Amino acid sequence: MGKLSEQLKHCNGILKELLSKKHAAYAWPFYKPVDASALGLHDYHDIIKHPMDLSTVKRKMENRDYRDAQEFAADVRLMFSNCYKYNPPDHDVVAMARKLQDVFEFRYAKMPD
Ligand SMILES: Cc1cc(-c2nc3ccccc3n2CC2CCOCC2)cn(C)c1=O
């Protein structure tokens, strides 16, 4: 219930942007947990030990799980890293990850301090 810190307000803003229609053309693979069984990716959980996605990040922010911006950023980067680990580098989903990570990194760099 307590107010997010100033840095976590900035993080929440970024999160809102990543989930916004503005970026939907490349963000949509990251909206929800990878459903490995549904997608036929029966090796996914053998390869990715720590799944992460934007819905999970949103829930953690709402629940005040993140104690600082660094913790938030680690989860967003984990999400991208998982994509880069599992998928061949020339896959369309990787191109989408790179584009969304560019959005993330450039706005994260504008953190107040
Ligand atoms: C391996 C993998 C799959 C998906 C994924 N989530 C989907 C949801 C609904 C429908 C399809 C979904 N996919 C696979 C798509 C295959 C084509 O490129 C976009 C993702 C997302 N990410 C980040 C991955 O690393």
As a whole number of angstroms, the distance between CA 112 and CA 105 comes to: 14
As a whole number of angstroms, the distance between CA 6 and CA 97 comes to: 27
Nearest CA to ligand 1 atom 8: 29
Q: What is the resolution of this structure in A?
A: 1.6
CA separation (Å) from 88 to 20, 31, 46, 62, 95? 27, 20, 16, 33, 10
Q: At what angle do helices 69-86 and 92-108 cross, to 10 degrees?
A: 160
Write down the experimental method used for this entry: X-ray
Query: Best substitution site from 32, 81, 93, 101 to test ligand 1's pocket, by max atoms within 8 Å of Cβ?
Result: 93
CATH number at residue 15: 1.20.920.10
Is residue 41 in contact with ligand 1, taking CB distance under 6 Å? yes
Number of domains in the chain: 1
Q: Which residues contact 3 (CB under 8 A, 6 or more apart)?
A: none
* Residue 58 domain boundaries: 1-113
Is residue 44 a contact partner of residue 34, using CB atoms and an 8 Å limit?
Answer: yes
Nearest CA to ligand 1 atom 21: 29
